[PDB]
C-alpha cells in the first residue's frame, strides 16, 4: 500500500518496505518519490556543497537493498556521461533544476556520441534511468541557483563507467562520498 511520505524519514521507512523483497516495482518507487514534497530543513544535514564539483552525500543504506543519497550541484556543475551498473536509478529534484541528457550506448566503432534527447528536471520531479534505457549526463546549467537532488540506486553499486562524448570510449570510475549520514568523509 503506497501512502504519501510526510517527511524524508517517512519516505525512508516506506522505501524499506518497498525493497523488503527481491524485486522492485519501479512505478511504485517513482510514485512515492514524486509524492515526497522537498522540505529543505529535513535534508539540510546532507546538503554539503563543494566549490569545484558536485558532491554525493549518503543518507541511507537500505538494509543492503539500496543506497539513498543526496547530490549537491554548484552553479555550472555537471556529471560525466555514465551508466548505472545494471541497477535501478531514481533521481528526484529537491532544489533548483537539472538538465538531463540521454545518450545511446556507443557502438564498437569510435565516434561522437549523439544525444537521444534532453530535458529539464524541475523541483520535486522524479526521473528514472537504467542501462536498458541508455546512458545519461546530469548538469546544473544555472548561473544563479545551486541544485540538490535525491538519488536511489538498487542494488547499490560503487563503480560505474564514464563515456567520452567525442569517441564513446569508456573508463571505469569509482564513486566517492563527500559525506555519510551527515558526517564528512576523510
Ligand atoms: Fe546517473
XYZ file of N, CA, C and O and ligand atoms in Angstrom:
745
model
N 0.810 -1.223 0.000
C 0.000 0.000 0.000
C 0.846 1.277 0.000
O 1.622 1.527 0.929
N 0.683 2.104 -1.026
C 1.505 3.291 -1.146
C 0.813 4.471 -0.490
O -0.259 4.850 -0.920
N 1.430 5.068 0.527
C 0.898 6.295 1.118
C 1.886 7.445 0.911
O 3.077 7.214 0.714
N 1.402 8.684 0.976
C 2.275 9.851 0.814
C 3.276 9.944 1.950
O 2.869 9.999 3.103
N 4.567 10.019 1.614
C 5.561 10.237 2.667
C 5.424 11.618 3.231
O 5.491 12.571 2.460
N 5.296 11.748 4.550
C 5.078 13.069 5.120
C 6.370 13.837 5.378
O 6.339 15.044 5.575
N 7.490 13.122 5.383
C 8.796 13.671 5.699
C 9.809 12.746 5.052
O 9.454 11.644 4.608
N 11.062 13.180 4.998
C 12.120 12.346 4.456
C 12.258 11.038 5.236
O 12.430 9.957 4.654
N 12.146 11.108 6.557
C 12.241 9.898 7.358
C 11.144 8.925 6.999
O 11.361 7.725 6.969
N 9.945 9.439 6.771
C 8.818 8.598 6.406
C 9.056 7.973 5.043
O 8.737 6.810 4.818
N 9.611 8.761 4.135
C 9.971 8.245 2.823
C 10.925 7.069 2.966
O 10.777 6.051 2.295
N 11.900 7.205 3.847
C 12.880 6.150 4.008
C 12.205 4.870 4.534
O 12.504 3.770 4.090
N 11.305 5.027 5.500
C 10.572 3.903 6.049
C 9.795 3.200 4.942
O 9.809 1.963 4.832
N 9.117 3.986 4.118
C 8.326 3.418 3.034
C 9.192 2.653 2.036
O 8.811 1.573 1.556
N 10.356 3.204 1.727
C 11.279 2.573 0.808
C 11.776 1.264 1.372
O 11.926 0.294 0.644
N 12.019 1.196 2.680
C 12.425 -0.075 3.284
C 11.368 -1.147 3.068
O 11.691 -2.313 2.830
N 10.105 -0.746 3.122
C 9.001 -1.671 2.883
C 8.966 -2.112 1.415
O 8.815 -3.317 1.115
N 9.138 -1.148 0.513
C 9.106 -1.435 -0.921
C 10.241 -2.323 -1.387
O 10.088 -3.068 -2.357
N 11.368 -2.251 -0.701
C 12.524 -3.059 -1.074
C 12.745 -4.286 -0.167
O 13.806 -4.895 -0.183
N 11.741 -4.651 0.610
C 11.857 -5.792 1.502
C 11.981 -7.119 0.746
O 12.535 -8.075 1.282
N 11.488 -7.164 -0.496
C 11.554 -8.366 -1.326
C 12.792 -8.402 -2.208
O 13.723 -7.619 -2.015
N 12.817 -9.290 -3.195
C 13.999 -9.390 -4.057
C 13.790 -8.756 -5.439
O 14.717 -8.730 -6.251
N 12.594 -8.228 -5.696
C 12.354 -7.446 -6.906
C 11.957 -6.017 -6.528
O 11.891 -5.663 -5.355
N 11.697 -5.202 -7.536
C 11.417 -3.794 -7.340
C 10.285 -3.428 -8.268
O 10.353 -3.719 -9.446
N 9.239 -2.807 -7.740
C 8.194 -2.241 -8.578
C 8.563 -0.793 -8.894
O 8.356 0.109 -8.081
N 9.145 -0.574 -10.065
C 9.688 0.728 -10.403
C 8.674 1.855 -10.376
O 8.957 2.959 -9.871
N 7.484 1.580 -10.888
C 6.458 2.600 -10.934
C 6.041 3.051 -9.534
O 5.759 4.220 -9.323
N 6.019 2.110 -8.593
C 5.596 2.406 -7.239
C 6.669 3.231 -6.569
O 6.368 4.178 -5.864
N 7.930 2.843 -6.745
C 9.016 3.619 -6.156
C 9.039 5.069 -6.688
O 9.171 6.023 -5.932
N 8.904 5.210 -7.993
C 8.859 6.516 -8.610
C 7.686 7.320 -8.046
O 7.845 8.489 -7.714
N 6.519 6.701 -7.918
C 5.361 7.428 -7.439
C 5.574 7.933 -6.006
O 5.169 9.038 -5.667
N 6.208 7.138 -5.156
C 6.373 7.565 -3.777
C 7.440 8.644 -3.699
O 7.306 9.592 -2.919
N 8.484 8.529 -4.503
C 9.487 9.595 -4.535
C 8.856 10.918 -5.011
O 9.137 11.985 -4.454
N 8.023 10.868 -6.045
C 7.384 12.095 -6.525
C 6.476 12.679 -5.459
O 6.339 13.898 -5.361
N 5.858 11.810 -4.669
C 4.908 12.243 -3.637
C 5.535 12.958 -2.455
O 4.871 13.741 -1.779
N 6.804 12.701 -2.190
C 7.512 13.411 -1.134
C 7.723 14.862 -1.574
O 8.281 15.105 -2.621
N 7.259 15.819 -0.783
C 7.487 17.230 -1.077
C 8.747 17.689 -0.379
O 8.819 17.693 0.842
N 9.753 18.049 -1.164
C 11.020 18.508 -0.628
C 10.838 19.528 0.489
O 10.184 20.566 0.318
N 11.439 19.230 1.633
C 11.470 20.160 2.745
C 12.931 20.379 3.131
O 13.556 19.515 3.751
N 13.489 21.536 2.746
C 14.920 21.780 2.924
C 15.412 21.560 4.353
O 16.549 21.143 4.536
N 14.593 21.821 5.355
C 15.055 21.607 6.716
C 15.378 20.141 7.007
O 16.243 19.842 7.844
N 14.671 19.222 6.347
C 14.805 17.780 6.600
C 16.059 17.204 5.977
O 16.538 16.165 6.410
N 16.585 17.869 4.966
C 17.755 17.355 4.309
C 18.955 18.305 4.385
O 20.014 18.015 3.832
N 18.815 19.422 5.096
C 19.936 20.354 5.267
C 21.214 19.654 5.728
O 22.319 20.029 5.325
N 21.063 18.638 6.567
C 22.216 17.905 7.089
C 23.087 17.326 5.999
O 24.310 17.205 6.158
N 22.450 16.965 4.905
C 23.106 16.220 3.839
C 23.586 17.104 2.731
O 24.359 16.657 1.889
N 23.175 18.363 2.747
C 23.384 19.240 1.610
C 24.723 19.965 1.739
O 24.803 21.165 2.036
N 25.785 19.208 1.519
C 27.128 19.737 1.685
C 27.739 19.958 0.309
O 28.103 19.013 -0.362
N 27.891 21.215 -0.079
C 28.431 21.573 -1.390
C 29.938 21.698 -1.378
O 30.546 21.903 -0.349
N 30.514 21.622 -2.569
C 31.949 21.794 -2.785
C 32.112 22.856 -3.856
O 31.313 22.908 -4.790
N 33.185 23.642 -3.772
C 33.450 24.712 -4.724
C 33.540 24.218 -6.185
O 33.068 24.871 -7.113
N 34.155 23.060 -6.376
C 34.621 22.666 -7.687
C 33.743 21.694 -8.438
O 33.708 21.715 -9.668
N 33.055 20.820 -7.718
C 32.184 19.859 -8.384
C 31.056 19.386 -7.496
O 30.986 19.735 -6.318
N 30.150 18.618 -8.083
C 29.030 18.136 -7.318
C 29.472 17.118 -6.265
O 30.463 16.412 -6.442
N 28.700 17.018 -5.180
C 29.031 16.091 -4.098
C 27.961 15.053 -3.907
O 26.793 15.329 -4.222
N 28.364 13.858 -3.456
C 27.442 12.775 -3.152
C 27.407 12.548 -1.653
O 28.444 12.333 -1.049
N 26.220 12.587 -1.051
C 26.079 12.531 0.391
C 25.124 11.396 0.784
O 23.933 11.451 0.525
N 25.655 10.344 1.382
C 24.880 9.139 1.656
C 23.910 9.403 2.787
O 24.294 9.912 3.831
N 22.657 9.016 2.585
C 21.596 9.225 3.558
C 21.179 7.891 4.213
O 20.967 7.828 5.442
N 21.039 6.832 3.415
C 20.547 5.540 3.927
C 21.051 4.383 3.089
O 21.166 4.505 1.862
N 21.341 3.255 3.742
C 21.855 2.078 3.040
C 20.850 0.969 2.807
O 21.220 -0.116 2.350
N 19.590 1.229 3.118
C 18.507 0.377 2.667
C 18.568 -1.056 3.145
O 18.088 -1.955 2.463
N 19.153 -1.291 4.311
C 19.333 -2.658 4.779
C 19.999 -3.499 3.686
O 19.692 -4.671 3.509
N 20.902 -2.866 2.943
C 21.662 -3.532 1.899
C 20.991 -3.578 0.530
O 21.622 -3.963 -0.454
N 19.725 -3.174 0.450
C 18.959 -3.341 -0.780
C 19.128 -2.144 -1.713
O 18.920 -2.244 -2.918
N 19.460 -0.989 -1.152
C 19.632 0.217 -1.970
C 20.500 1.235 -1.273
O 20.692 1.152 -0.060
N 21.047 2.171 -2.043
C 21.702 3.349 -1.465
C 20.819 4.541 -1.780
O 20.400 4.693 -2.906
N 20.532 5.368 -0.781
C 19.811 6.607 -0.982
C 20.791 7.713 -0.666
O 21.414 7.698 0.406
N 20.933 8.681 -1.569
C 21.927 9.738 -1.364
C 21.437 11.078 -1.897
O 20.527 11.131 -2.720
N 22.040 12.154 -1.418
C 21.709 13.496 -1.863
C 22.936 14.067 -2.569
O 24.054 13.991 -2.056
N 22.729 14.589 -3.780
C 23.792 15.195 -4.560
C 23.600 16.711 -4.614
O 22.499 17.199 -4.810
N 24.692 17.455 -4.438
C 24.650 18.897 -4.372
C 25.445 19.484 -5.516
O 26.621 19.230 -5.612
N 24.796 20.294 -6.345
C 25.367 20.734 -7.601
C 25.527 22.254 -7.608
O 24.547 23.001 -7.649
N 26.757 22.718 -7.500
C 27.035 24.125 -7.669
C 26.600 24.620 -9.027
O 26.343 23.829 -9.926
N 26.556 25.939 -9.182
C 26.232 26.544 -10.450
C 27.235 26.083 -11.477
O 28.434 26.177 -11.254
N 26.749 25.564 -12.593
C 27.634 25.075 -13.624
C 28.234 23.699 -13.407
O 28.984 23.228 -14.256
N 27.919 23.035 -12.298
C 28.459 21.699 -12.058
C 27.656 20.661 -12.814
O 26.440 20.699 -12.818
N 28.337 19.680 -13.387
C 27.642 18.584 -14.033
C 28.387 17.285 -13.885
O 29.463 17.242 -13.326
N 27.787 16.218 -14.382
C 28.388 14.912 -14.321
C 28.971 14.499 -15.679
O 28.831 15.171 -16.687
N 29.624 13.364 -15.670
C 30.032 12.684 -16.886
C 28.826 11.990 -17.489
O 27.783 11.876 -16.854
N 28.982 11.498 -18.708
C 28.004 10.566 -19.280
C 28.319 9.223 -18.618
O 29.444 8.730 -18.704
N 27.322 8.596 -18.018
C 27.583 7.397 -17.262
C 26.452 6.410 -17.331
O 25.319 6.752 -17.654
N 26.799 5.184 -16.993
C 25.835 4.109 -16.843
C 25.553 3.889 -15.366
O 25.988 4.684 -14.512
N 24.798 2.841 -15.059
C 24.393 2.579 -13.680
C 24.559 1.116 -13.264
O 23.869 0.613 -12.379
N 25.483 0.426 -13.913
C 25.990 -0.830 -13.392
C 24.874 -1.819 -13.091
O 24.831 -2.471 -12.035
N 23.956 -1.906 -14.044
C 22.888 -2.890 -14.012
C 21.945 -2.720 -12.826
O 21.256 -3.650 -12.438
N 21.855 -1.494 -12.328
C 20.967 -1.172 -11.224
C 19.868 -0.210 -11.631
O 19.978 0.496 -12.635
N 18.831 -0.156 -10.798
C 17.781 0.840 -10.919
C 18.300 2.164 -10.375
O 18.987 2.170 -9.363
N 17.972 3.275 -11.023
C 18.460 4.577 -10.555
C 17.340 5.573 -10.649
O 16.802 5.819 -11.704
N 16.959 6.110 -9.515
C 15.907 7.107 -9.436
C 16.501 8.433 -9.012
O 17.388 8.486 -8.166
N 15.981 9.517 -9.565
C 16.518 10.839 -9.285
C 15.383 11.803 -9.038
O 14.532 11.965 -9.893
N 15.351 12.440 -7.884
C 14.317 13.417 -7.593
C 14.903 14.764 -7.244
O 15.804 14.839 -6.423
N 14.441 15.836 -7.860
C 14.969 17.161 -7.552
C 14.416 17.687 -6.244
O 13.199 17.687 -6.039
N 15.304 18.114 -5.354
C 14.917 18.712 -4.079
C 15.033 20.249 -4.090
O 14.397 20.906 -3.288
N 15.884 20.797 -4.967
C 16.083 22.242 -5.075
C 16.677 22.554 -6.433
O 17.558 21.828 -6.884
N 16.177 23.601 -7.091
C 16.735 24.034 -8.355
C 16.289 23.191 -9.529
O 15.242 22.557 -9.487
N 17.099 23.203 -10.579
C 16.818 22.462 -11.799
C 18.066 21.771 -12.314
O 19.164 22.262 -12.121
N 17.884 20.626 -12.966
C 18.989 19.931 -13.608
C 18.596 19.597 -15.028
O 17.443 19.269 -15.287
N 19.563 19.661 -15.928
C 19.386 19.228 -17.301
C 19.872 17.791 -17.408
O 21.009 17.493 -17.020
N 19.017 16.906 -17.912
C 19.379 15.512 -18.102
C 19.481 15.282 -19.587
O 18.524 15.552 -20.317
N 20.634 14.804 -20.044
C 20.777 14.456 -21.444
C 20.932 12.956 -21.551
O 21.745 12.368 -20.839
N 20.173 12.349 -22.467
C 20.220 10.911 -22.682
C 21.077 10.612 -23.888
O 20.980 11.293 -24.916
N 21.908 9.587 -23.777
C 22.711 9.132 -24.900
C 22.503 7.645 -25.143
O 22.204 6.889 -24.222
N 22.691 7.218 -26.387
C 22.690 5.808 -26.701
C 23.988 5.156 -26.265
O 25.026 5.810 -26.179
N 23.930 3.859 -25.993
C 25.147 3.091 -25.799
C 25.942 3.185 -27.080
O 25.397 2.990 -28.173
N 27.238 3.466 -26.956
C 28.047 3.588 -28.167
C 28.309 2.254 -28.869
O 28.322 1.199 -28.243
N 28.496 2.323 -30.181
C 28.903 1.165 -30.975
C 30.388 0.871 -30.761
O 31.114 1.679 -30.191
N 30.845 -0.288 -31.215
C 32.251 -0.642 -31.061
C 33.156 0.381 -31.757
O 34.301 0.591 -31.356
N 32.630 1.026 -32.791
C 33.407 1.982 -33.564
C 33.527 3.308 -32.824
O 32.561 3.775 -32.214
N 34.716 3.901 -32.867
C 34.953 5.211 -32.264
C 34.192 6.294 -33.016
O 34.354 6.446 -34.227
N 33.371 7.049 -32.294
C 32.513 8.050 -32.909
C 31.895 8.983 -31.881
O 31.732 8.616 -30.720
N 31.559 10.194 -32.313
C 30.900 11.158 -31.440
C 29.632 10.507 -30.926
O 28.882 9.907 -31.683
N 29.372 10.652 -29.632
C 28.100 10.220 -29.072
C 27.064 11.314 -29.282
O 27.268 12.458 -28.866
N 25.952 10.965 -29.918
C 24.893 11.934 -30.166
C 23.772 11.740 -29.155
O 23.490 10.619 -28.724
N 23.130 12.840 -28.785
C 22.112 12.810 -27.746
C 20.799 12.272 -28.288
O 20.370 12.666 -29.376
N 20.175 11.365 -27.542
C 18.827 10.918 -27.851
C 17.893 12.079 -27.618
O 17.033 12.373 -28.442
N 18.056 12.724 -26.467
C 17.119 13.731 -26.025
C 17.645 14.396 -24.775
O 18.667 14.006 -24.224
N 16.930 15.411 -24.328
C 17.321 16.117 -23.128
C 16.074 16.667 -22.512
O 15.076 16.862 -23.179
N 16.109 16.849 -21.209
C 15.021 17.526 -20.557
C 15.488 18.201 -19.307
O 16.542 17.873 -18.760
N 14.706 19.185 -18.889
C 14.971 19.883 -17.656
C 14.119 19.252 -16.589
O 12.905 19.149 -16.721
N 14.772 18.796 -15.534
C 14.060 18.268 -14.389
C 13.891 19.406 -13.414
O 14.856 20.090 -13.074
N 12.665 19.608 -12.955
C 12.363 20.728 -12.085
C 12.110 20.245 -10.675
O 11.958 19.042 -10.440
N 12.031 21.181 -9.736
C 11.861 20.812 -8.336
C 10.718 19.820 -8.143
O 9.617 19.975 -8.709
N 11.038 18.793 -7.359
C 10.154 17.724 -6.912
C 9.868 16.650 -7.947
O 9.324 15.600 -7.628
N 10.271 16.904 -9.180
C 10.134 15.908 -10.229
C 11.097 14.738 -10.042
O 12.199 14.908 -9.498
N 10.642 13.502 -10.313
C 11.463 12.268 -10.163
C 11.581 11.496 -11.478
O 10.574 11.064 -12.059
N 12.826 11.323 -11.918
C 13.157 10.609 -13.137
C 13.701 9.222 -12.813
O 14.052 8.922 -11.665
N 13.783 8.371 -13.829
C 14.248 7.022 -13.642
C 15.143 6.700 -14.806
O 14.820 7.040 -15.942
N 16.267 6.050 -14.530
C 17.103 5.518 -15.595
C 17.631 4.143 -15.260
O 17.781 3.786 -14.109
N 17.875 3.337 -16.283
C 18.602 2.090 -16.096
C 19.329 1.854 -17.395
O 19.107 2.600 -18.366
N 20.230 0.869 -17.410
C 21.124 0.691 -18.546
C 20.343 0.307 -19.790
O 20.815 0.508 -20.905
N 19.151 -0.253 -19.626
C 18.423 -0.696 -20.810
C 17.842 0.512 -21.552
O 17.626 0.457 -22.753
N 17.618 1.602 -20.824
C 17.095 2.845 -21.380
C 18.209 3.588 -22.111
O 18.011 4.110 -23.205
N 19.391 3.610 -21.504
C 20.555 4.243 -22.100
C 21.481 4.845 -21.039
O 21.392 4.489 -19.856
N 22.346 5.754 -21.485
C 23.312 6.467 -20.655
C 22.800 7.888 -20.433
O 21.981 8.375 -21.202
N 23.227 8.550 -19.370
C 22.912 9.963 -19.269
C 23.981 10.797 -18.614
O 24.946 10.296 -18.062
N 23.774 12.091 -18.776
C 24.567 13.121 -18.134
C 23.581 14.025 -17.434
O 22.468 14.249 -17.927
N 23.975 14.533 -16.271
C 23.124 15.426 -15.499
C 23.945 16.658 -15.189
O 25.096 16.536 -14.778
N 23.370 17.842 -15.371
C 24.140 19.078 -15.216
C 23.296 20.175 -14.607
O 22.143 20.320 -14.951
N 23.874 20.970 -13.721
C 23.213 22.187 -13.303
C 23.729 23.310 -14.194
O 24.837 23.799 -14.010
N 22.930 23.711 -15.173
C 23.371 24.740 -16.101
C 23.102 26.151 -15.601
O 23.468 27.137 -16.246
N 22.480 26.257 -14.441
C 22.185 27.564 -13.883
C 23.446 28.348 -13.514
O 24.452 27.765 -13.072
N 23.380 29.666 -13.692
C 24.434 30.557 -13.222
C 24.137 31.168 -11.863
O 24.984 31.842 -11.306
N 22.927 30.963 -11.346
C 22.473 31.672 -10.160
C 21.859 30.795 -9.065
O 21.647 31.280 -7.959
N 21.592 29.519 -9.344
C 20.913 28.661 -8.371
C 21.566 27.283 -8.257
O 21.571 26.484 -9.205
N 22.133 26.996 -7.085
C 22.648 25.650 -6.844
C 21.491 24.669 -6.855
O 20.383 25.109 -6.598
N 21.735 23.405 -7.177
C 20.683 22.387 -7.228
C 20.996 21.270 -6.258
O 22.160 21.024 -5.906
N 19.944 20.589 -5.822
C 20.089 19.484 -4.889
C 19.144 18.380 -5.332
O 17.994 18.657 -5.637
N 19.644 17.146 -5.420
C 18.813 16.032 -5.841
C 18.945 14.830 -4.923
O 19.964 14.664 -4.243
N 17.906 13.992 -4.927
C 17.854 12.778 -4.148
C 17.924 11.590 -5.104
O 17.137 11.510 -6.035
N 18.901 10.710 -4.910
C 19.115 9.564 -5.782
C 18.968 8.266 -5.014
O 19.460 8.144 -3.905
N 18.375 7.280 -5.657
C 18.172 5.948 -5.095
C 18.660 4.938 -6.117
O 18.223 4.954 -7.267
N 19.600 4.097 -5.700
C 20.139 3.051 -6.554
C 19.959 1.688 -5.922
O 20.261 1.483 -4.747
N 19.465 0.752 -6.724
C 19.245 -0.599 -6.235
C 19.476 -1.610 -7.329
O 18.892 -1.505 -8.411
N 20.321 -2.616 -7.069
C 21.155 -2.792 -5.886
C 22.163 -1.645 -5.776
O 22.396 -0.924 -6.737
N 22.764 -1.474 -4.600
C 23.808 -0.458 -4.514
C 24.980 -0.822 -5.407
O 25.252 -2.011 -5.610
N 25.651 0.189 -5.944
C 26.901 -0.002 -6.678
C 27.867 1.123 -6.362
O 27.462 2.260 -6.082
N 29.150 0.809 -6.397
C 30.156 1.815 -6.089
C 31.113 2.033 -7.231
O 32.086 2.785 -7.084
N 30.840 1.394 -8.366
C 31.623 1.622 -9.567
C 30.676 1.755 -10.744
O 29.575 1.219 -10.737
N 31.114 2.490 -11.750
C 30.361 2.605 -12.981
C 31.328 2.998 -14.084
O 32.529 2.980 -13.885
N 30.805 3.348 -15.251
C 31.658 3.794 -16.334
C 31.294 5.202 -16.774
O 30.125 5.578 -16.788
N 32.305 5.985 -17.116
C 32.099 7.276 -17.735
C 32.456 7.133 -19.218
O 33.369 6.379 -19.579
N 31.732 7.854 -20.069
C 31.918 7.754 -21.512
C 32.375 9.078 -22.126
O 31.822 10.129 -21.838
N 33.377 9.031 -22.998
C 33.855 10.260 -23.613
C 32.931 10.642 -24.757
O 32.736 9.869 -25.689
N 32.342 11.830 -24.680
C 31.389 12.249 -25.697
C 31.967 12.228 -27.127
O 31.231 12.011 -28.086
N 33.269 12.437 -27.269
C 33.852 12.546 -28.604
C 34.090 11.197 -29.282
O 34.116 11.117 -30.527
N 34.270 10.143 -28.493
C 34.638 8.834 -29.042
C 33.732 7.685 -28.618
O 33.652 6.668 -29.308
N 33.044 7.847 -27.493
C 32.312 6.755 -26.898
C 33.159 5.843 -26.030
O 32.645 4.860 -25.499
N 34.444 6.143 -25.882
C 35.323 5.303 -25.080
C 34.873 5.346 -23.630
O 34.473 6.391 -23.137
N 34.927 4.211 -22.945
C 34.503 4.203 -21.550
C 35.667 3.937 -20.613
O 36.613 3.212 -20.950
N 35.592 4.564 -19.448
C 36.559 4.391 -18.388
C 35.820 4.052 -17.103
O 34.730 4.577 -16.829
N 36.405 3.153 -16.323
C 35.803 2.733 -15.070
C 36.056 3.793 -14.002
O 37.158 4.286 -13.840
N 35.012 4.148 -13.279
C 35.109 5.147 -12.229
C 34.601 4.567 -10.919
O 33.661 3.786 -10.910
N 35.229 4.946 -9.817
C 34.756 4.519 -8.512
C 34.125 5.720 -7.863
O 34.743 6.775 -7.787
N 32.886 5.582 -7.421
C 32.232 6.722 -6.793
C 32.709 6.914 -5.371
O 33.109 5.976 -4.692
N 32.690 8.165 -4.955
C 33.148 8.544 -3.640
C 31.998 9.251 -2.978
O 31.132 9.805 -3.660
N 31.969 9.200 -1.660
C 31.066 10.034 -0.910
C 31.791 11.230 -0.301
O 32.907 11.137 0.174
N 31.127 12.362 -0.309
C 31.581 13.551 0.375
C 31.220 13.469 1.835
O 31.920 14.008 2.693
N 30.099 12.826 2.120
C 29.653 12.599 3.491
C 28.774 11.362 3.559
O 28.257 10.900 2.526
N 28.608 10.835 4.774
C 27.767 9.685 5.034
C 27.050 9.936 6.331
O 27.699 10.200 7.352
N 25.729 9.816 6.298
C 24.893 10.018 7.475
C 25.191 11.382 8.116
O 25.140 11.522 9.336
N 25.498 12.376 7.276
C 25.750 13.737 7.715
C 27.179 14.040 8.146
O 27.483 15.169 8.512
N 28.052 13.043 8.094
C 29.442 13.176 8.543
C 30.378 13.209 7.348
O 30.364 12.287 6.528
N 31.183 14.261 7.236
C 32.138 14.348 6.132
C 33.100 13.165 6.125
O 33.512 12.675 7.174
N 33.442 12.711 4.927
C 34.383 11.619 4.777
C 35.807 12.180 4.795
O 36.061 13.265 4.305
N 36.738 11.435 5.377
C 38.141 11.853 5.452
C 38.798 11.995 4.086
O 39.469 13.003 3.871
Fe 23.107 8.922 -13.400
